[PDB]
Amino acid sequence: GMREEKIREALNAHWQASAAGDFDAEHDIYDDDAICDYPQSGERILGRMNLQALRSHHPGKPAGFEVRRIQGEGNLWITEYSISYNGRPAYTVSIMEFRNGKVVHETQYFSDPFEAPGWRSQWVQQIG
Amino acid sequence: GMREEKIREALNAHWQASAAGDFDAEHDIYDDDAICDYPQSGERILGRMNLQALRSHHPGKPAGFEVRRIQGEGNLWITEYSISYNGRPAYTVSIMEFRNGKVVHETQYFSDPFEAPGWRSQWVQQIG
Ligand SMILES: [Ca+2]
Ligand SMILES: [Ca+2]
Incomplete structure (x- = not known):
C-alpha cells in the first residue's frame, strides 16, 4: 500500500520546512x-x-x-542530515516513531565531523 | 512470527560480544x-x-x-548505546540494515555529551 510512502512524503515536507x-x-x-x-x-x-x-x-x-538519507520501515523512521550555523556543521540523526501517521517520539543526536585517521586509510573507501 | 525477535536476539548477542x-x-x-x-x-x-x-x-x-535502547521494524534496526575509553564516553548510534538475517549495511555515529542549557531548563524534563 501507500503507508510508508505517505510517511516519507510527510518527512520530506518536514525537512523542507x-x-x-x-x-x-x-x-x-x-x-x-x-x-x-x-x-x-x-x-x-x-x-x-x-x-x-x-x-x-x-x-x-x-x-x-541538507538531508543525507532517510530510511524507514513501518512506524520507525531515521533521518540522517546536516545542519550548520556559523560555518560549523553538525551530522545529525533524527529517530522518529510514528503512530497513526504522526510522530509520537523523536530522538535526536548532534555529532561533529572527525578526520578519517591515517592508520586505516589503506582499508577504507572515502565516500563522503 | 518470530522474525524481528530473532534479529533482536542476534543484536543483544552482538552487543554483548x-x-x-x-x-x-x-x-x-x-x-x-x-x-x-x-x-x-x-x-x-x-x-x-x-x-x-x-x-x-x-x-x-x-x-x-551500555545499551540505551534498541528499536527495530522489519529489516531496519537502530541501537543507541554508550562506549567509553579513558573516562570519555561517546553516545553512539548504530543503524543496521538486514537481509536474510544478516547485516548488510551499518552506519555509525559517535557523539559527545553536552550540558543541558540553562535557558530551556524550565521547559525540559531531565530523564538521563
Ligand atoms: Ca493531548
Ligand atoms: Ca561475498
Missing part, C-alpha cells in the same frame, strides 16, 4: 503530545507546542541544511 | 560483504573481515559499554 525555517510546517508532523529527547544531554521536551517554541527561539532556522 | 571484546562473536551478525559507514568522516569499510580487523586493532575493546 526545517530548512526553510517554517516552524509551523516543521511541526505539523507531530502528535500533540510528542516527546523529543536529546540523549547527549539527558533532556526531554514534552509536547508539540513546547518543541516548536523552543526550536523557534534557539537555534532557530539553520544557515545550512 | 562488543562489551566483552569477543571480536569473533561481534562480527557473526554481518554478511560477508557488509559495509560500515562513518558519515562523520566520510569513511566506508567494506567486508566483515576488514571490519573486524580494523575494530580489533583500534580502538579495540571498550573500557565501558
Whole structure:
C-alpha cells in the first residue's frame, strides 16, 4: 500500500520546512503530545507546542541544511542530515516513531565531523 | 512470527560480544560483504573481515559499554548505546540494515555529551 510512502512524503515536507525555517510546517508532523529527547544531554521536551517554541527561539532556522538519507520501515523512521550555523556543521540523526501517521517520539543526536585517521586509510573507501 | 525477535536476539548477542571484546562473536551478525559507514568522516569499510580487523586493532575493546535502547521494524534496526575509553564516553548510534538475517549495511555515529542549557531548563524534563 501507500503507508510508508505517505510517511516519507510527510518527512520530506518536514525537512523542507526545517530548512526553510517554517516552524509551523516543521511541526505539523507531530502528535500533540510528542516527546523529543536529546540523549547527549539527558533532556526531554514534552509536547508539540513546547518543541516548536523552543526550536523557534534557539537555534532557530539553520544557515545550512541538507538531508543525507532517510530510511524507514513501518512506524520507525531515521533521518540522517546536516545542519550548520556559523560555518560549523553538525551530522545529525533524527529517530522518529510514528503512530497513526504522526510522530509520537523523536530522538535526536548532534555529532561533529572527525578526520578519517591515517592508520586505516589503506582499508577504507572515502565516500563522503 | 518470530522474525524481528530473532534479529533482536542476534543484536543483544552482538552487543554483548562488543562489551566483552569477543571480536569473533561481534562480527557473526554481518554478511560477508557488509559495509560500515562513518558519515562523520566520510569513511566506508567494506567486508566483515576488514571490519573486524580494523575494530580489533583500534580502538579495540571498550573500557565501558551500555545499551540505551534498541528499536527495530522489519529489516531496519537502530541501537543507541554508550562506549567509553579513558573516562570519555561517546553516545553512539548504530543503524543496521538486514537481509536474510544478516547485516548488510551499518552506519555509525559517535557523539559527545553536552550540558543541558540553562535557558530551556524550565521547559525540559531531565530523564538521563
Ligand atoms: Ca493531548
Ligand atoms: Ca561475498
